[PDB]
Amino acid sequence: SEVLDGFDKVDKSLTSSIDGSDKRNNLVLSELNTAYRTNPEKVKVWYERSLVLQKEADSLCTFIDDLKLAIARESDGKDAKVNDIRRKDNLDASSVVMLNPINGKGSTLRKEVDKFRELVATLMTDKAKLKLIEQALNTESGTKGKSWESSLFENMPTVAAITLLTKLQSDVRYAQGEVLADLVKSVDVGDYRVNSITAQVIPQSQIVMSGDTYKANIVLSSVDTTQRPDVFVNGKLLSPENMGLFTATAGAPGTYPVKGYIEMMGNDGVKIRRDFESEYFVTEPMASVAPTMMNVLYAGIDNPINIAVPGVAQQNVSATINNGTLTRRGNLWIARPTKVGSEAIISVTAQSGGRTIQMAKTTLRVRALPDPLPYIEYKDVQGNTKRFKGGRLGKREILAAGGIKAALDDDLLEVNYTVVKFQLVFYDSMGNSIPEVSDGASFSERQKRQIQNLGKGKRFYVTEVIARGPDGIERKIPAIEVIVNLE
Amino acid sequence: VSSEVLDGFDKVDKSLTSSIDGSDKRNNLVLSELNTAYRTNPEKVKVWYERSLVLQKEADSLCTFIDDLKLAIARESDGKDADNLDASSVVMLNPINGKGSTLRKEVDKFRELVATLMTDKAKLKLIEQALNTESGTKGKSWESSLFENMPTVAAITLLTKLQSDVRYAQGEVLADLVKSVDVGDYRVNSITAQVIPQSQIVMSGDTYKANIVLSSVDTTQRPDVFVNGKLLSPENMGLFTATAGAPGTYPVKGYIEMMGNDGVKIRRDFESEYFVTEPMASVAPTMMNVLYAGIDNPINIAVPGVAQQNVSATINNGTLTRRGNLWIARPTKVGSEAIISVTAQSGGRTIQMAKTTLRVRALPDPLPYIEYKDVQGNTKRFKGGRLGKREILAAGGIKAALDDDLLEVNYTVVKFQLVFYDSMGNSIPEVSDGASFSERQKRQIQNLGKGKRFYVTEVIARGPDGIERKIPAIEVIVNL
């Protein structure tokens, strides 16, 4: 009597839980409906799968409702309830309904459960780890050789079988609720989650010089490690295999820009884009490649120096000097020392923005101007000019040069000298030395007459030549010997 | 109770136990998901993860209580056997100690906790509140209605059903606590594209690295950027600026902190470093861009912050090797140019630097001189003019050297001539015995009256570069 009251109380608890869970799943389905009315571009698929789930779950549950009614009717009669059945048919109805080899219903219920389980396998996308739990919740395996319907409805009372069928309905409801929750969570897969929030230090220059200023912008970023947006940068699209990492090799010096935009598929179906624009500077590094014989400055003449600092422009490098004068002139400096035989330091100072960096000092040497060499600038009849540093020359070329010039050996364009005095020594027909002086830098008249009267092959000597340099001091340059020829 | 009804009760018991053990794993899995999300971004998950912990605490201390109740009912039934008896009546309704009232008090406590934790979908909470109802029929208590006249296995299966309900309720509350974490929205905060570079100022030949991302920056606040012991003033917009002092490696250590939207201060630590090298001065005259051929030109290559053990340079014109802390260049193509391409090696990279262009010439021809020690004790270099007829022969002969003092190299005379002039106008040339005066030269110097001249002419002197040159001549006026 009351032993069945306990079982029917268990059945009442199961039915109340089924009512609760079945009304609960409707709320999630209603949330899916409201979300369908908003952005039905991909919510359509989840809504349709949820509708199919509802169809199949309600089909199986109505099947089990009719099975409970058929088990209850196989006890008392057609007019019998499904809750408080009288007495206990511990052999009569539960086995005859679910095991009759003619109208076998156990196999049919088992195959319907199998259909629902495989449908769940097809509907639940993510949480495949939980798909195994949902499958175990609908296990199709009895005990030993007895089939699934066998052990459950072999020698079972009628209420003891109605309770099992109600528990099967409850399991179907819980499974469909979990699958509906899975679909709702799958509607929001790549919807811009916040995962890593880090603090970063963006430095202007990772390497600074003593006296300069370190500049670092310290910012936070709340980026998503899941979504992969399209990052168009400097015209072309960045390869998605870079995970958003613009790489550009620093070419020629300058200020290369980095401008573009990020386009990301938003969670509401529309694409959102944000434009960005920044700059990255490039410099070229130090080559202190100085042969140990460069450090010489000549006193008097303007020495052109090239002072350069990496990154700092040409109008910010400002250098001084202690021994002489250092003056800018376009892009080059010009040095004029004073004390010959002593060193000279050049203090370099740059200015990076609003602060004066004092660069490393450099000590050079100072040496007077070298002595030039005298020559007879002669050109043959074919036009091209040559210099004559002693030897054999024609009377015509000797007279055409007008005088004795003076220039450096490795001439180039540096310095230009001039002569102030020189003598010409001849030897007459008695061994006497006739030293005739010249009109400064040009030949005299006695000299030109001697040269006109010199026989083919005789020697005359340009001696005691005093020349002048731009440093304002006169110097004695070596003598030369000339032999008259005929050409 | 017949054995078949007992079998049915125990079958329902085992099926409900299977449901419990499944919905238990499906809850520990959600707790693990929450724990991983808390490992990732903890600031927005602390509250809900701690609430899930509170739930697992207070939901397991109730299932353990119901397990104890089942064990006590079984103990009473076994003590009676040592059917349909008072197994659930002496345990749940004993006026001395009846655990039914305590059970429903614990159920009300857990239900109030579930009501406290469930935030969104309060109808779902109202549903959970119905699965844990404490109400009875007619004038009986809840436990009095659930355990009055019911056998052992019926009461045990009902308690197992209560455990199953508690487990499913816990799972639903966990799902709610997941939704609340996921809807901690940061997308209502405006998103901007950020270019985060490794270094904004790079060198040529290197590379510029910069991640390009979308960050949810919140310009509505004034964040605290604590940097190196002292906080940055709020009007700096988080911009660390320090003048570089002594050269070396200086750190940039600290944190940033800003008040989140949900009231939890998000703080993130950072530690970077900036290197201070030495000031560079590239001073170089353009007139001195010369590498004399033949000989060994000493060059010194210096690079900031890189010792000479890593620098490597080459040259198209000839050879360039090392001789300690400096290189030595040896060009072999006169007149043309010579470019030196330098290569440095810092941390895991080979930097190609500036190609320095230089001009190559030949060693300048020296000047000849007669090195004479005057009778006063000094040493001078006669180069034309008057000289005595003893300081000449005492010198030995003609020497030659650079008038300047770039005297890392020195020259040697190999041949010269003395050109006397006879008493008839013709010239008398006498060759030399190397760099010293020949015997005939000494004799004809000894036979020279005052005021007479002789000329050192055709002075071939050998150089350290190999080639020999013809250097100028010098006039000597013999006097007494």
GROMACS .gro file of N, CA, C and O in nm, chain A residues 94-180:
model
  348
   94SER      N    1   0.398  -0.409  -1.726
   94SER     CA    2   0.524  -0.348  -1.766
   94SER      C    3   0.602  -0.437  -1.862
   94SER      O    4   0.669  -0.385  -1.952
   95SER      N    5   0.594  -0.569  -1.845
   95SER     CA    6   0.666  -0.659  -1.935
   95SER      C    7   0.588  -0.686  -2.062
   95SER      O    8   0.647  -0.698  -2.170
   96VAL      N    9   0.455  -0.696  -2.053
   96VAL     CA   10   0.375  -0.727  -2.171
   96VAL      C   11   0.375  -0.610  -2.268
   96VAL      O   12   0.365  -0.630  -2.390
   97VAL      N   13   0.387  -0.487  -2.219
   97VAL     CA   14   0.386  -0.372  -2.309
   97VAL      C   15   0.521  -0.355  -2.379
   97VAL      O   16   0.527  -0.323  -2.498
   98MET      N   17   0.631  -0.379  -2.307
   98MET     CA   18   0.764  -0.348  -2.357
   98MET      C   19   0.840  -0.470  -2.407
   98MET      O   20   0.954  -0.455  -2.454
   99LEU      N   21   0.782  -0.590  -2.400
   99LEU     CA   22   0.853  -0.710  -2.442
   99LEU      C   23   0.769  -0.804  -2.528
   99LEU      O   24   0.819  -0.911  -2.564
  100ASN      N   25   0.645  -0.770  -2.560
  100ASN     CA   26   0.561  -0.857  -2.640
  100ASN      C   27   0.623  -0.875  -2.778
  100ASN      O   28   0.637  -0.776  -2.853
  101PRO      N   29   0.662  -0.997  -2.817
  101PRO     CA   30   0.730  -1.016  -2.946
  101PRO      C   31   0.647  -0.975  -3.067
  101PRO      O   32   0.704  -0.960  -3.176
  102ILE      N   33   0.517  -0.956  -3.051
  102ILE     CA   34   0.431  -0.913  -3.161
  102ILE      C   35   0.445  -0.763  -3.181
  102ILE      O   36   0.503  -0.717  -3.280
  103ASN      N   37   0.392  -0.685  -3.086
  103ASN     CA   38   0.403  -0.539  -3.090
  103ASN      C   39   0.508  -0.493  -2.990
  103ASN      O   40   0.480  -0.431  -2.888
  104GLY      N   41   0.633  -0.524  -3.023
  104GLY     CA   42   0.744  -0.491  -2.936
  104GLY      C   43   0.767  -0.341  -2.930
  104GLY      O   44   0.791  -0.277  -3.034
  105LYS      N   45   0.760  -0.284  -2.810
  105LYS     CA   46   0.780  -0.141  -2.791
  105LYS      C   47   0.914  -0.106  -2.727
  105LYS      O   48   0.957   0.009  -2.739
  106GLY      N   49   0.979  -0.201  -2.661
  106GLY     CA   50   1.109  -0.173  -2.603
  106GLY      C   51   1.213  -0.138  -2.708
  106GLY      O   52   1.289  -0.042  -2.693
  107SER      N   53   1.219  -0.217  -2.815
  107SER     CA   54   1.313  -0.188  -2.923
  107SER      C   55   1.282  -0.054  -2.989
  107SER      O   56   1.373   0.020  -3.026
  108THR      N   57   1.153  -0.022  -3.004
  108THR     CA   58   1.115   0.106  -3.064
  108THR      C   59   1.159   0.223  -2.978
  108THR      O   60   1.215   0.321  -3.029
  109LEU      N   61   1.135   0.215  -2.846
  109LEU     CA   62   1.180   0.321  -2.757
  109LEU      C   63   1.332   0.333  -2.757
  109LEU      O   64   1.387   0.444  -2.757
  110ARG      N   65   1.402   0.219  -2.758
  110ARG     CA   66   1.548   0.221  -2.761
  110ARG      C   67   1.599   0.288  -2.888
  110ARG      O   68   1.692   0.370  -2.883
  111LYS      N   69   1.538   0.257  -3.003
  111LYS     CA   70   1.584   0.317  -3.128
  111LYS      C   71   1.548   0.465  -3.137
  111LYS      O   72   1.623   0.542  -3.198
  112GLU      N   73   1.437   0.506  -3.076
  112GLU     CA   74   1.407   0.649  -3.069
  112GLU      C   75   1.510   0.723  -2.984
  112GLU      O   76   1.556   0.833  -3.020
  113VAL      N   77   1.548   0.664  -2.870
  113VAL     CA   78   1.653   0.723  -2.787
  113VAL      C   79   1.784   0.730  -2.865
  113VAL      O   80   1.859   0.828  -2.855
  114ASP      N   81   1.813   0.627  -2.945
  114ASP     CA   82   1.934   0.628  -3.027
  114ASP      C   83   1.930   0.740  -3.131
  114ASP      O   84   2.031   0.808  -3.153
  115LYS      N   85   1.816   0.758  -3.196
  115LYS     CA   86   1.800   0.868  -3.291
  115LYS      C   87   1.827   1.002  -3.224
  115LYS      O   88   1.900   1.086  -3.277
  116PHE      N   89   1.769   1.023  -3.105
  116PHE     CA   90   1.790   1.149  -3.035
  116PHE      C   91   1.936   1.168  -2.996
  116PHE      O   92   1.990   1.279  -3.005
  117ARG      N   93   2.002   1.061  -2.953
  117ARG     CA   94   2.141   1.070  -2.911
  117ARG      C   95   2.232   1.106  -3.028
  117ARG      O   96   2.321   1.192  -3.016
  118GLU      N   97   2.211   1.042  -3.143
  118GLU     CA   98   2.292   1.076  -3.260
  118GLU      C   99   2.261   1.216  -3.312
  118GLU      O  100   2.351   1.287  -3.358
  119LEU      N  101   2.134   1.259  -3.303
  119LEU     CA  102   2.102   1.397  -3.335
  119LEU      C  103   2.178   1.494  -3.246
  119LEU      O  104   2.229   1.596  -3.293
  120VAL      N  105   2.186   1.464  -3.116
  120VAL     CA  106   2.265   1.547  -3.025
  120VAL      C  107   2.411   1.548  -3.067
  120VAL      O  108   2.478   1.652  -3.062
  121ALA      N  109   2.463   1.432  -3.109
  121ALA     CA  110   2.599   1.427  -3.162
  121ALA      C  111   2.616   1.520  -3.282
  121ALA      O  112   2.724   1.577  -3.301
  122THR      N  113   2.511   1.537  -3.363
  122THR     CA  114   2.520   1.626  -3.478
  122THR      C  115   2.494   1.773  -3.445
  122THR      O  116   2.539   1.860  -3.520
  123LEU      N  117   2.424   1.803  -3.336
  123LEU     CA  118   2.383   1.940  -3.308
  123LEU      C  119   2.482   2.017  -3.221
  123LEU      O  120   2.506   2.136  -3.245
  124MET      N  121   2.539   1.951  -3.121
  124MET     CA  122   2.629   2.017  -3.026
  124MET      C  123   2.766   2.035  -3.090
  124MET      O  124   2.838   1.936  -3.112
  125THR      N  125   2.803   2.159  -3.122
  125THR     CA  126   2.929   2.183  -3.192
  125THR      C  127   3.046   2.185  -3.094
  125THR      O  128   3.127   2.091  -3.091
  126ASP      N  129   3.057   2.289  -3.012
  126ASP     CA  130   3.165   2.299  -2.915
  126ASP      C  131   3.138   2.207  -2.796
  126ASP      O  132   3.034   2.142  -2.787
  127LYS      N  133   3.234   2.203  -2.703
  127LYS     CA  134   3.225   2.118  -2.584
  127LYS      C  135   3.200   1.973  -2.622
  127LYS      O  136   3.110   1.906  -2.569
  128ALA      N  137   3.281   1.923  -2.716
  128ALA     CA  138   3.280   1.780  -2.746
  128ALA      C  139   3.321   1.698  -2.625
  128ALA      O  140   3.290   1.579  -2.619
  129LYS      N  141   3.392   1.759  -2.530
  129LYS     CA  142   3.420   1.693  -2.403
  129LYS      C  143   3.292   1.666  -2.325
  129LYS      O  144   3.279   1.563  -2.258
  130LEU      N  145   3.195   1.758  -2.334
  130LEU     CA  146   3.066   1.740  -2.268
  130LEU      C  147   2.970   1.655  -2.350
  130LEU      O  148   2.871   1.605  -2.295
  131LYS      N  149   2.997   1.638  -2.479
  131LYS     CA  150   2.914   1.550  -2.561
  131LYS      C  151   2.920   1.406  -2.510
  131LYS      O  152   2.820   1.334  -2.518
  132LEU      N  153   3.034   1.364  -2.457
  132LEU     CA  154   3.044   1.230  -2.399
  132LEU      C  155   2.957   1.217  -2.275
  132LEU      O  156   2.896   1.112  -2.252
  133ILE      N  157   2.951   1.323  -2.193
  133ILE     CA  158   2.863   1.320  -2.076
  133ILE      C  159   2.717   1.314  -2.119
  133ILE      O  160   2.636   1.241  -2.061
  134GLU      N  161   2.682   1.391  -2.222
  134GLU     CA  162   2.545   1.388  -2.273
  134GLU      C  163   2.510   1.253  -2.334
  134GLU      O  164   2.394   1.211  -2.329
  135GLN      N  165   2.609   1.184  -2.392
  135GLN     CA  166   2.584   1.049  -2.443
  135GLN      C  167   2.568   0.949  -2.330
  135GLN      O  168   2.480   0.862  -2.335
  136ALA      N  169   2.653   0.959  -2.227
  136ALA     CA  170   2.640   0.870  -2.112
  136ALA      C  171   2.508   0.892  -2.039
  136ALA      O  172   2.456   0.799  -1.976
  137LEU      N  173   2.454   1.013  -2.045
  137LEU     CA  174   2.322   1.038  -1.988
  137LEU      C  175   2.212   0.962  -2.063
  137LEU      O  176   2.103   0.944  -2.008
  138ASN      N  177   2.239   0.919  -2.186
  138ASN     CA  178   2.145   0.837  -2.261
  138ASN      C  179   2.210   0.704  -2.300
  138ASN      O  180   2.207   0.665  -2.417
  139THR      N  181   2.270   0.636  -2.202
  139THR     CA  182   2.340   0.511  -2.230
  139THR      C  183   2.243   0.403  -2.274
  139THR      O  184   2.132   0.390  -2.221
  140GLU      N  185   2.284   0.325  -2.374
  140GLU     CA  186   2.204   0.217  -2.430
  140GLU      C  187   2.278   0.086  -2.408
  140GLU      O  188   2.336   0.028  -2.500
  141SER      N  189   2.276   0.038  -2.283
  141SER     CA  190   2.341  -0.087  -2.246
  141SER      C  191   2.294  -0.133  -2.109
  141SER      O  192   2.317  -0.066  -2.009
  142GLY      N  193   2.226  -0.248  -2.105
  142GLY     CA  194   2.173  -0.299  -1.980
  142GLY      C  195   2.276  -0.366  -1.893
  142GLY      O  196   2.384  -0.311  -1.870
  143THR      N  197   2.245  -0.486  -1.844
  143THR     CA  198   2.335  -0.562  -1.758
  143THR      C  199   2.350  -0.703  -1.813
  143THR      O  200   2.250  -0.772  -1.835
  144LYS      N  201   2.474  -0.745  -1.835
  144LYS     CA  202   2.508  -0.880  -1.882
  144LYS      C  203   2.441  -0.900  -2.018
  144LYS      O  204   2.453  -0.813  -2.105
  145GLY      N  205   2.371  -1.012  -2.041
  145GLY     CA  206   2.312  -1.037  -2.171
  145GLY      C  207   2.178  -0.970  -2.194
  145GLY      O  208   2.131  -0.966  -2.308
  146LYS      N  209   2.116  -0.918  -2.088
  146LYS     CA  210   1.989  -0.850  -2.102
  146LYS      C  211   2.007  -0.721  -2.181
  146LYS      O  212   2.101  -0.644  -2.157
  147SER      N  213   1.916  -0.697  -2.275
  147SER     CA  214   1.920  -0.575  -2.354
  147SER      C  215   1.882  -0.455  -2.268
  147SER      O  216   1.859  -0.466  -2.147
  148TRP      N  217   1.873  -0.338  -2.332
  148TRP     CA  218   1.839  -0.216  -2.258
  148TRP      C  219   1.696  -0.222  -2.205
  148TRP      O  220   1.671  -0.192  -2.088
  149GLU      N  221   1.601  -0.262  -2.290
  149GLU     CA  222   1.462  -0.271  -2.246
  149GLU      C  223   1.440  -0.390  -2.154
  149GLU      O  224   1.350  -0.387  -2.069
  150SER      N  225   1.521  -0.495  -2.168
  150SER     CA  226   1.504  -0.618  -2.092
  150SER      C  227   1.514  -0.594  -1.942
  150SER      O  228   1.414  -0.608  -1.870
  151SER      N  229   1.633  -0.557  -1.894
  151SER     CA  230   1.653  -0.538  -1.751
  151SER      C  231   1.560  -0.431  -1.694
  151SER      O  232   1.519  -0.439  -1.578
  152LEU      N  233   1.526  -0.330  -1.775
  152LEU     CA  234   1.442  -0.221  -1.726
  152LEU      C  235   1.295  -0.260  -1.717
  152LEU      O  236   1.222  -0.203  -1.635
  153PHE      N  237   1.249  -0.356  -1.798
  153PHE     CA  238   1.109  -0.395  -1.799
  153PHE      C  239   1.095  -0.546  -1.817
  153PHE      O  240   1.033  -0.595  -1.912
  154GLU      N  241   1.154  -0.624  -1.726
  154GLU     CA  242   1.139  -0.769  -1.728
  154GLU      C  243   1.042  -0.817  -1.620
  154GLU      O  244   0.937  -0.874  -1.652
  155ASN      N  245   1.075  -0.795  -1.493
  155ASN     CA  246   0.986  -0.826  -1.381
  155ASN      C  247   0.973  -0.701  -1.293
  155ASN      O  248   1.012  -0.700  -1.177
  156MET      N  249   0.918  -0.595  -1.352
  156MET     CA  250   0.910  -0.466  -1.287
  156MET      C  251   0.765  -0.425  -1.261
  156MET      O  252   0.679  -0.445  -1.348
  157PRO      N  253   0.736  -0.371  -1.144
  157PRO     CA  254   0.601  -0.319  -1.118
  157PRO      C  255   0.565  -0.205  -1.213
  157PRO      O  256   0.651  -0.145  -1.278
  158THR      N  257   0.435  -0.177  -1.221
  158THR     CA  258   0.386  -0.077  -1.315
  158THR      C  259   0.431   0.063  -1.277
  158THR      O  260   0.479   0.139  -1.362
  159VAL      N  261   0.417   0.099  -1.149
  159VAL     CA  262   0.467   0.229  -1.105
  159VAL      C  263   0.620   0.231  -1.109
  159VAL      O  264   0.680   0.334  -1.139
  160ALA      N  265   0.683   0.117  -1.081
  160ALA     CA  266   0.829   0.109  -1.090
  160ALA      C  267   0.879   0.126  -1.233
  160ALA      O  268   0.997   0.160  -1.252
  161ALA      N  269   0.794   0.104  -1.333
  161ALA     CA  270   0.831   0.128  -1.472
  161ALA      C  271   0.791   0.268  -1.517
  161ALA      O  272   0.863   0.330  -1.597
  162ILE      N  273   0.678   0.319  -1.468
  162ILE     CA  274   0.638   0.456  -1.498
  162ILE      C  275   0.740   0.554  -1.442
  162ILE      O  276   0.770   0.657  -1.503
  163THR      N  277   0.796   0.523  -1.325
  163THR     CA  278   0.900   0.608  -1.268
  163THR      C  279   1.026   0.608  -1.354
  163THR      O  280   1.087   0.713  -1.375
  164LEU      N  281   1.064   0.492  -1.407
  164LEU     CA  282   1.180   0.485  -1.495
  164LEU      C  283   1.156   0.562  -1.624
  164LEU      O  284   1.246   0.632  -1.674
  165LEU      N  285   1.036   0.551  -1.680
  165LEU     CA  286   1.004   0.626  -1.802
  165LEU      C  287   1.002   0.777  -1.775
  165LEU      O  288   1.045   0.856  -1.859
  166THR      N  289   0.953   0.817  -1.658
  166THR     CA  290   0.956   0.958  -1.621
  166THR      C  291   1.099   1.008  -1.605
  166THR      O  292   1.132   1.120  -1.645
  167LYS      N  293   1.186   0.924  -1.548
  167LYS     CA  294   1.327   0.962  -1.537
  167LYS      C  295   1.392   0.971  -1.674
  167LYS      O  296   1.480   1.056  -1.695
  168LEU      N  297   1.351   0.886  -1.768
  168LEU     CA  298   1.402   0.897  -1.905
  168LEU      C  299   1.358   1.028  -1.969
  168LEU      O  300   1.436   1.094  -2.037
  169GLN      N  301   1.231   1.066  -1.948
  169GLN     CA  302   1.185   1.197  -1.994
  169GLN      C  303   1.268   1.310  -1.932
  169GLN      O  304   1.305   1.406  -2.001
  170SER      N  305   1.297   1.300  -1.802
  170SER     CA  306   1.377   1.402  -1.735
  170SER      C  307   1.517   1.410  -1.795
  170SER      O  308   1.571   1.520  -1.812
  171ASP      N  309   1.577   1.295  -1.826
  171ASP     CA  310   1.709   1.295  -1.888
  171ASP      C  311   1.705   1.357  -2.027
  171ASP      O  312   1.797   1.432  -2.065
  172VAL      N  313   1.600   1.329  -2.104
  172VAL     CA  314   1.585   1.392  -2.235
  172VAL      C  315   1.576   1.543  -2.220
  172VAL      O  316   1.638   1.619  -2.296
  173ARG      N  317   1.499   1.590  -2.121
  173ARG     CA  318   1.484   1.734  -2.101
  173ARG      C  319   1.617   1.799  -2.061
  173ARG      O  320   1.652   1.906  -2.112
  174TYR      N  321   1.691   1.736  -1.970
  174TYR     CA  322   1.820   1.791  -1.929
  174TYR      C  323   1.919   1.793  -2.044
  174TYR      O  324   1.995   1.890  -2.061
  175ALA      N  325   1.919   1.688  -2.127
  175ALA     CA  326   2.008   1.684  -2.242
  175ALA      C  327   1.974   1.795  -2.341
  175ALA      O  328   2.063   1.864  -2.392
  176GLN      N  329   1.844   1.815  -2.369
  176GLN     CA  330   1.807   1.920  -2.463
  176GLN      C  331   1.837   2.058  -2.406
  176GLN      O  332   1.874   2.149  -2.481
  177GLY      N  333   1.825   2.076  -2.274
  177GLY     CA  334   1.862   2.203  -2.214
  177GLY      C  335   2.011   2.231  -2.228
  177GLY      O  336   2.051   2.344  -2.260
  178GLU      N  337   2.094   2.130  -2.207
  178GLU     CA  338   2.238   2.149  -2.222
  178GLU      C  339   2.275   2.177  -2.368
  178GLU      O  340   2.362   2.260  -2.396
  179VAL      N  341   2.209   2.109  -2.463
  179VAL     CA  342   2.237   2.135  -2.604
  179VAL      C  343   2.193   2.275  -2.643
  179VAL      O  344   2.260   2.344  -2.722
  180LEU      N  345   2.080   2.321  -2.589
  180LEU     CA  346   2.035   2.457  -2.616
  180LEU      C  347   2.133   2.560  -2.559
  180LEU      O  348   2.164   2.660  -2.625
   0.00000   0.00000   0.00000
